[PDB]
Design a binder for this molecule. Structure first.
Ligand SMILES: Nc1ncnc2c1ncn2[C@@H]1O[C@H](COP(=O)(O)OP(=O)(O)NP(=O)(O)O)[C@@H](O)[C@H]1O
Ligand SMILES: C[S@](=N)(=O)CC[C@H](N)C(=O)O
Ligand SMILES: [Mg+2]
Ligand SMILES: [Mg+2]
Ligand SMILES: [Mg+2]
Lengths: 225, 204
């Protein structure tokens, strides 16, 4: 609200749209995450790989496990899916996640470990709801901690270059598929309560509206069929 | 051959006595039939430096001696006869002139009983007269090669030229739209290298 308001006062306009230009990097909203006790200790701080604790990695396990449904919430628009799995931009990289994977200090994954004691979830975009996003992430993380979820193996590769080199699960490719995953995800749907079903209904309505819009690409490439 | 008689028989009123310079530019004099007998023997005079031949303004005239066997009545304007010519300078064939240079190479090969024959694939685009765009705004698809639609959209131009090649005896056998939008190709039988070279020059 502040950015949009001040931009206007300067005769400019601000947009948090996930992918406002087809050939340029999109708007992310990465969240750096840590879990603390009331006494002021960071539970993610640890002696495991990269300065992380088993609690941190179980939380990551929740993120990985629930990634499909989580995508619906933190990538909540049709347009979100043009930021994810995007073709290479003029600057040489999209910098957004393509796959359900994590690396170290490595910006080509769904999750990056930027430094000891925290996780960076790089999945969300500028459309992500400021409340549903932490809520959805937390629900997924808590369940990871409760089930001692295994996040799998860290990938120290450039996933844009060497995604083919490894077997990795792709993120949902469009809003409708992400929403279906949300609805089928009990932990997530139950963690968000009635907000999840309400959200899903709205997003389905948006999809039905979008999927009927004729595009210029279609006209150009189909008129002469 | 007797060019004056042919002129009278076939109703040719003018001849283009034509030569190709180093840069490929067709240079010609348009001469009325009444003057062809003289020109065919002595050649048409030009200031060589004014064409791409690498001469001097101070040099004597080159003389373009037409090859009567190359005669072509312009099929779109049959009152005009086109002739390919060899540039002569100081009483000898001029070695800087493309056609003369080819004839020399050919003569060496021929002295060894080896005769080059070739065919040419002279791809071209059809574009707007101002050169801004291709002639056909509906020719847009990513793989346009051999496109039936775009080919037939220019049927009149292509068919006309092909039929001229039929009448001239070049043995044309196919035409199509090529791989770039706006691009075309018209093929005809290979021949002795000099024949093909002359036809190449006329074709363009
Ligand atoms: N023995 C030969 N010597 C010289 N030229 C020949 C000979 N036989 C055929 N040709 C000529 O070779 C040319 C063939 O060109 P074309 O029909 O366009 O075939 P292509 O080169 O396989 N086509 P493209 O896909 O455009 O490269 C014609 O001009 C033929 O007449
Ligand atoms: C990696 S970065 N240089 O922080 C860019 C992130 C990118 N805008 C994104 O879509 O997340
Ligand atoms: Mg970041
Ligand atoms: Mg060809
Ligand atoms: Mg070709």
């Amino acid at each position: 609200f502040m950015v949009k308001s001040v931009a206007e006062r300067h005769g400019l306009r601000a947009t948090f749209m996930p992918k406002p230009f087809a050939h340029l990097t999109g708007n992310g909203c990465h969240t750096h995450l840590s879990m603390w006790t009331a006494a002021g200790d960071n539970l993610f701080e640890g002696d495991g790989e990269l300065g992380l604790s088993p609690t941190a990695y179980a939380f990551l396990g929740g993120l990985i496990g629930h990634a499909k449904g989580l995508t619906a919430v933190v990538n909540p628009t049709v347009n979100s899916y043009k930021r994810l799995n995007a073709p290479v931009t003029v600057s040489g990289a999209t910098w957004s996640p393509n796959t359900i994977t994590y690396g170290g200090n490595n910006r080509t994954h769904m999750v990056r470990i930027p430094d000891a004691g925290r996780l960076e979830l790089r999945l969300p975009d500028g459309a992500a709801n400021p409340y549903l996003m932490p809520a959805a992430i937390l629900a997924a993380g808590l369940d990871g901690i409760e089930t001692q979820a295994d996040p799998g193996q860290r990938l120290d590769i450039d996933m844009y270059v060497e995604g083919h080199s490894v077997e990795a699960e792709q993120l949902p490719l469009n809003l409708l598929d992400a929403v279906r995953a949300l609805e089928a995800d009990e932990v997530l749907a139950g963690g968000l309560g009635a907000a999840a079903a309400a959200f899903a209904k709205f997003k389905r309505a948006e999809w039905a509206d979008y999927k009927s819009q004729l595009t210029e690409w279609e006209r150009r490439t189909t008129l002469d069929c | 051959t007797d060019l004056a008689s042919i002129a009278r028989e076939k109703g040719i009123e003018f001849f283009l006595i034509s030569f190709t310079d180093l840069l490929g530019v067709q240079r010609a004099k348009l001469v009325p039939a009444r003057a062809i007998a003289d020109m065919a023997v002595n050649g048409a005079g030009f200031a060589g430096f004014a064409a791409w031949l690498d001469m001097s303004p101070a040099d004597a005239d080159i003389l373009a001696i037409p090859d009567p066997e190359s005669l072509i009545q312009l099929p779109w304007k049959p009152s005009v006869g086109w002739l390919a010519a060899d540039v002569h300078f100081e009483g000898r064939p001029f070695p800087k002139a493309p056609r003369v240079a080819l004839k020399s190479v050919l003569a060496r090969a021929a002295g060894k009983d080896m005769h080059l024959k070739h065919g040419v694939e002279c791809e071209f685009f059809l574009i707007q007269p101002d050169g801004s765009a291709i002639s056909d705004p509906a020719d847009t698809q990513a793989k346009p090669c051999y496109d039936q639609d775009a080919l037939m959209r220019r049927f009149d131009v292509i068919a006309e030229i092909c039929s001229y090649m039929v009448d001239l005896g070049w043995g044309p056998y196919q035409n199509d739209h090529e791989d770039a939008n706006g691009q075309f190709e018209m093929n005809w039988d290979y021949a002795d290298a000099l024949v093909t070279a002359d036809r190449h020059a006329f074709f363009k």
